[PDB]
């Protein structure tokens, strides 16, 4: 079997996190990059780290990874969490409401609002799944 | 020590139940204690159903099924791989194994 | 970086025993055990017998 | 050898903003640095080992023995504590028990037997503590009686500052750990009991975390 240990995976993960722009999909190019940006005592460890960096690059090219915190794969998350629409989806010209909710709003503070319309209650009072 | 909340059976306010006989065995086991298994099967398996259907007078004929109820004693049921032992915290699970297939 | 001391002998009794004091970091296998740890074995001549020293 | 507090309570005590552990006990805050109490109570905090009890675990290659240490801590005019720690060696277990005992000490209160003259000397009421099968009762005594107990609750009551007590024990008292924890839980219950000496409406003073938050936000992040 060929399963990478935790040292190779941690080294490749911090290499992907910390030096991301000067990388690529070629094994020899990021092999030389990992040769110069870090100190690896042996050569088999260098080749295994470079191979996992290539695999992680191919994985990043398809989507995000929950071990990696680079700059480029975020801030579209930030723009996605900060885009603001026009239509509120709560400021509606008509809103359906239940009759007991209408009577509850009658008692609370109001007599009549020009936004609500009332729907009929259900004629069947079945709501529970048959379990027994 | 006491192993179960019940006593390995389903008797709560009775004191006596009628006994039944095992099917793999001949032990006189009480009716609510014995592990019961209602199994339904076809007369033919999935391999011979095509051979029965190709040699049938009636086209689009429904194959009958076989209905039998099995009564097992405790040692007979655990030795025939019907029920096995489980963990102390998992012994209180009441739901059967899932009917995925 | 870390050390261990092993003293084996008839430590307070007729039957011998051994006490091991391990804390820190100590590698055991491979080529880097040759040039990272330093092993010395010594013998102590007391009035009751021989006591050994293993330090690394 | 220096103090680097990891909690804001320890930093606040080190910054001389908390006068004593009175308000710490009043606000019922947990103490997680054992040297806060060592700062508040210094040379007046004596200790001695109650019993070293060996425990063993059976493995494939014999028994792995371990030593468990019991130590009593406390000043002779107030607070008292108890700590249990087990390790491979004896000295490591004893020092860990010392740290764990000094980490968790409780205040005791003293009352009178009849008239309220002089300083308080005895247990104010009848308190009981139980753990395992052991029951320990503390009964008030007149002045000059002394402690009528087994030696381990006697030394715990002398290190707690109580001069007079009547006791009555029930259960397997041969186990020293359960007996010591039982009398510790008995003597710790002297403040959970409601007496008519304090029925007036208390006022809730401000917590140190509210009072010194401007100091805390500057001294630490």
């Amino acid at each position: 079997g060929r399963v990478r240990t935790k040292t190779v995976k941690k080294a490749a993960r911090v290499i992907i996190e910390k030096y991301y722009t000067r990388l690529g999909n070629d094994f020899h190019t990021n092999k030389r990059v990992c040769e110069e940006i870090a100190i690896i005592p042996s050569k088999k460890l260098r080749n295994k780290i470079a191979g996992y960096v290539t695999h992680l690059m191919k994985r990043i090219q398809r989507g995000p990874v929950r071990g990696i915190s680079i700059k480029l794969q975020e801030e579209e998350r930030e723009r996605r969490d900060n885009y603001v629409p026009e239509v509120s989806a709560l400021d509606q010209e008509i809103i359906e409401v239940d009759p007991d909710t209408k009577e509850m709003l009658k008692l609370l503070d109001f007599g009549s609002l020009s936004n609500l319309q009332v729907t009929q209650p259900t004629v069947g009072m079945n709501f529970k799944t048959p379990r027994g | 020590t006491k192993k179960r909340r019940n006593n390995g059976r389903a008797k709560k306010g009775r004191g006596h139940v009628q006994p039944i006989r095992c099917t793999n065995c001949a032990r006189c086991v009480p009716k609510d204690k014995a592990i019961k298994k209602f199994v339904i099967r076809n007369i033919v398996e999935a391999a011979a159903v095509r051979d029965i259907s190709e040699a049938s007078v009636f086209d689009a004929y429904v194959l009958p099924k076989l209905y039998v109820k099995l009564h097992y004693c405790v040692s007979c049921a655990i030795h025939s791989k019907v029920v096995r032992n489980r963990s102390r915290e998992a012994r209180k699970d009441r739901t059967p194994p899932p009917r995925f297939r | 970086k870390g050390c261990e001391v092993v003293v084996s002998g008839k430590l307070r009794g007729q039957r011998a025993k051994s006490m091991k004091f391990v804390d820190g970091l100590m590698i055991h296998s491979g080529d880097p055990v040759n040039y990272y740890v330093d092993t010395a074995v010594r013998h102590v001549l007391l009035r009751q017998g021989v006591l050994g020293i293993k330090v690394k | 050898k220096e103090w680097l507090p990891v909690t804001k309570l320890g930093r606040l005590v080190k910054d001389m903003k908390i006068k004593s552990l009175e308000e710490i006990y009043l606000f019922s805050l947990p103490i997680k640095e054992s040297e806060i109490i060592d700062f508040f109570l210094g040379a007046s905090l004596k200790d001695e080992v109650l019993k070293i009890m060996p425990v063993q675990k059976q493995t494939r290659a014999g028994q792995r023995t371990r030593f468990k240490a019991f130590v009593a801590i406390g000043d002779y005019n107030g607070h008292v504590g108890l700590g249990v720690k087990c390790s491979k060696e004896v000295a490591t277990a004893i020092r860990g028990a010392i740290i764990l005992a000094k980490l968790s000490i409780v205040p005791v209160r003293r009352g009178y037997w009849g008239n309220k003259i002089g300083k308080p000397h005895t247990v104010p009421c009848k308190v009981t503590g139980r753990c395992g099968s052991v029951l320990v009762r503390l009964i008030p005594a007149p002045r000059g009686t002394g402690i009528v107990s087994a030696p381990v609750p006697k030394k715990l009551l002398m290190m707690a500052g109580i001069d007079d007590c009547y006791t009555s024990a029930r259960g397997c008292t041969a186990t020293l750990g359960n007996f010591a924890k039982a009398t510790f839980d008995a003597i710790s219950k002297t403040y959970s009991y409601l007496t008519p000496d304090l029925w007036k409406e208390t006022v809730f003073t401000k917590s140190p975390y509210q009072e010194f938050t401007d100091h805390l936000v500057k001294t630490h992040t």
Partner: protein, 83 residues
């Protein structure tokens, strides 16, 4: 708490739970002390006053503490009486 001469011999006076009138112990870490802010009567802004309540750990672990805080706020006048 006192003697014949008149001074106090208890080293501290412990708190009592405002919902159950039980003494909060020194090692009872489940007990809380919540401060509730008082508001200005005209503008509606926090001025600097507090309303304090202490609940013991037994009431909090029983699950009947939120109605205790609601009742204390009703009796203090924080939560309106009609509710």
């Amino acid at each position: 708490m006192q003697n014949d001469a008149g001074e106090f011999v208890d080293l501290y006076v412990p708190r009592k739970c405002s919902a159950s009138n039980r003494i909060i112990g020194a090692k009872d870490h489940a007990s809380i002390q919540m401060n509730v802010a008082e508001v200005d009567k005209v503008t509606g802004r926090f001025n600097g006053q507090f309303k304090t309540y202490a609940i013991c750990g037994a009431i909090r672990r029983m699950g009947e503490s939120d109605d205790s805080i609601l009742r204390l706020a009703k009796a203090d006048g924080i939560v309106s009486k009609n509710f």
